[model samples]
Each structure stands twice: as structure tokens, then as C-alpha cells.
Target: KVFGRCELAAAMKRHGLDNYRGYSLGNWVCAAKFESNFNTQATNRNTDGSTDYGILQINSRWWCNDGRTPGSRNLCNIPCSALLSSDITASVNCAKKIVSDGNGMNAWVAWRNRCKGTDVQAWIRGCRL
Candidate 1:
């Protein structure tokens, strides 16, 4: 599978190369790979009439309400998660933003390093941003 675990792992490593003293790139890759198969187009339906969408599953309606391009068939118009097309980098970036508070990368990185795996809180405690 082109978008299998290994490929997604590699992409995770590439994007998370600078990750240190936190959840290794491998871990994040595993999470993303498992979460969306690197689909970037993944989404989740919430019972509260809300949804999570994108490679990292961002609800574009929440963050990028104005991220849409006029007169174009772009996913951004719907939700950032749907916008996750063929751009892994873009997906990662969007994920980072969504994780952060309304448009910050801090939360995303923090979540990846801490909230993603077992003993996540311990990992966060021991690591530095």
C-alpha cells in the first residue's frame, strides 16, 4: 500500500525531523498513519453536530472559516480536513494549526509529543519545548 504504515512513517520522520526530547517522529508518524492512513482527507463525525476533519482531522469550519478559495473546488471551503488533498506538508501544517489554539502550532506539537501515546503525560513532563 502506497499510503501504508511505512510510507506514513517516513513522512512523519521527514516532517518531524526536528523533534527531540519528546515523542519521537516515529511515534507521531504511527499516530498519524493510524489515525488517517495519511489520507489527509479523513474526518470524524461528532454527536454534537460538530466534526473533525483533515490529515490531522481539523474542523476547517472552526479554524479556517476563511481558508476557502473563491470559485474553486477546494476542500477548505467545507472543512480543513477535507482540504487535505495531495499535500502531506500542507496536511501536517494544518494539523499543527488545528491542534494549537485557533491557529497556533504549539498545541499540535505538544499533543504529538505528549497526548499521543502511553505515558504521554510523563513524556510531556520530561520533555522541553
Candidate 2:
């Protein structure tokens, strides 16, 4: 709902994410593509009873409140629903904080499995940004 790959690259650049927290735009874009396909309303239920939210697919176990997840760390202190919006400010901020905590993009399995060690130039190939 939020962006196409090109639009996402532009938007992310506008949000100052080109090289944020030492992660490249390619890393973020590639992870976002695999994680949510740029859909802000994306959600995936994990077999362990946790749910990933929004484009970044943040987990309810530690990042956001999903009501049903017990002992949620809620480190971002925002409702999980807040992340499921076209407005990515909350999601970006929370992701930044998560990365700043030393997790980096390793917090996302999608990044580790699909993005890390791969050439991700296609994720931003034609983006004017």
C-alpha cells in the first residue's frame, strides 16, 4: 500500500535512509521487497504464535503490541496496527531503534536469508533517487 519499489527507494531516501545506521538503501529495499512486497498492511503469523507487522514485518514479541502476544517487550511502544499504515514514520523509527540496538538488519530473517550476501542492485535499479 505504501510504495512500489521505485517509490519506496525515493521515499526511503526522503526519510534519510540511504545509508542509515550503516545499512545501505539496497539492503533496506531488498529486505522490504522480500518481507512485505512493499505492502504496509502486510502481516504474517509465525508458527510460534508471533505475528510480523507491516512492510518491515516487525515482530510482536519485542517491537510492537499485538494484544494477544503475552510478555511483549513493546520496545517501540506503539500499537502493531500503527506499523500497518502507509505512513512509514513509526515503522522507520522503530526499525532504526532496533538496528541501533546492535541487531542491525539481522532482526529480520528476510534480510538475512534473502538480502545478505546477495547483490541487491535490482531493488533500486531504475529508481531516480
Candidate 3:
């Protein structure tokens, strides 16, 4: 489930990510673009042998338990597999926990590099939100 830019915005908004913790829908979409390109099944392996899963790339080391990452916190208290679904409900919920718990949108380096301090409104320009 690869999403278009605006579609991702609408979805995130539906899950209450818009302006969540002062991060707008644009911010979330931009992060997702750089992190996973809006692909629901996106996954990446970290050099530390942990993995990042789902659209927001929640990590196995701190946020989820993949049964492989050493010293995993399972902070989100969810299986890593929950993130890779088209509905995005679980992904969005976990993301909320990440940001709400002081991780903020800065958790994703992609957001820090590309989306931060930029005019991200364009990321959601087409969705009529």
C-alpha cells in the first residue's frame, strides 16, 4: 500500500496526527516520504541487528519487539509485524506513542534532514484537507 502524498496526509489526520505535538500532517507525510516512500510493507535492517518496520519506520530496539533485537524495550508494546498493514491504524497509534512520549517528530532522521524547518505545506497541497 503505497500512498500518494495527499492521501497519506488525510490518513494521518484521520488518526489525529495533524498538529500532534506541534507536528502537522505535512510533517508526518514528509517523514513517511523519506522514510518509506509511503509503502506499508516498508522495512529496514539497522546495523545494530535491530530492524525498522512500517511506514514511520518504528524501530525494533526501542519501540517494538521483533524477538530478535537485543534489549528491546517494546515501548509500543506491539509486535513489529503490526506496522506493515494497509490500514495504518496500528502504525499511526505507535507513532503517536513515539511522539507523545517526547521522542517528537525528530525521531526520524529523514524528517530532520529533509522535512524539518521547511515549508512542508506543499506535501499536502492536493488532498483538499
Candidate 4:
């Protein structure tokens, strides 16, 4: 599917993914580039050697102990894990709800301003979708 740039950018801004001008795309690019190369469906092992999975490289071992469970793509309010069996859109939407809280886009801006910095934390703080 061809996702609209402005729509996606707006959603990102709402969730602190991008700035008003979409400058934050760099942050996301950097995140995916460094973290998983923009791979929305990436997974990795945690520091303790646990399994972390998902597009944003969310860990399921710590987040969920199901051991490569499904529906991870739709996970929210929980930690990330390795190995997924669901849709990344769900996971992204979950993150969006978490950061936005039904608010327009200010929540995202706040997260970016306050959370932007460092590695993926900054990206997570202001991720739209």
C-alpha cells in the first residue's frame, strides 16, 4: 500500500515521530538506519540475551513471555520482544496511541522536545506510526 507522506508525517508528528516540517524524519531514518535500517519488522536479542522483536525492534521476552507469540504487531503498553507473528501496523498504532493518548499532535511534540536525544529512545518518544 502506498502510504501518504503528509498523512504519515502528520501521524508521526502527532506521536512525536516528526516535527512540524517533518525534520524528525531524520531521527527516524537514523533510528531505522542505526537500529534496524528502517526495518519496521526487525527483531534482536536484549542486553541480558533475551529475545527482542518487532519493527522498532521491540523485545518480547521481557515484554511478553509467550516465547515468539503472535499479535505482537498489535501490542501496546507492553515491552518489545524478539520474533513476531502479527502485523507491524498494529504495533505502530499501539505505540501511536500510547504516545498520543487520543490527543491531536501536541503529545508527540512534547515527547520529541522532552524525549528527543540519544538513540532509539528519542525515536520512541516521538514516533507517529
Best by TM-score: 3
Total backbone collisions, model 3: 0
Instruction: List the candidates' TM-scores in order.
Output: 0.53, 0.93, 0.96, 0.40
Window of ten residues with lowest summed lDDT in model 1: 120-129
Q: How many residue pairs clash in model 4?
A: 22
What do the candidate models score in CA lDDT, each in turn?
0.49, 0.88, 0.91, 0.43
Q: How do the residues 43-72 of candidate 4 rate in per-residue lDDT, one tens digit apiece?
A: 665455555455444445323454455434
RMSD of each candidate?
7.8, 1.2, 0.9, 9.1
Which 10-residue window of candidate 4 scores lowest in summed lDDT? 1-10
Model 2 misplaced stretches (Cα beyond 4 Å):
none
- Which ten residues in a row are the worst by lDDT in model 3? 97-106
What lDDT score is found at residue 62 in candidate 2? 90
Write model 1 residue lDDT over 4-118, tens digit each, in one string: 5455655655675335334455545545544565676676765544455555555434544423423333333344533556657766655554444343323344345544655
Which of candidates 1 and 4 is the stronger one according to lDDT? Answer: 1
For candidate 2, lDDT tens digit of each residue in 38-74? 9999999987777999999999989899998878899
Candidate 1: the clashing residue pairs are 40-55, 53-57, 53-58, 53-81, 54-57, 54-81, 60-80
Question: Candidate 3, clashing residue pairs?
Answer: none
Backbone clash count for every predicted candidate, in the order shown: 7, 0, 0, 22
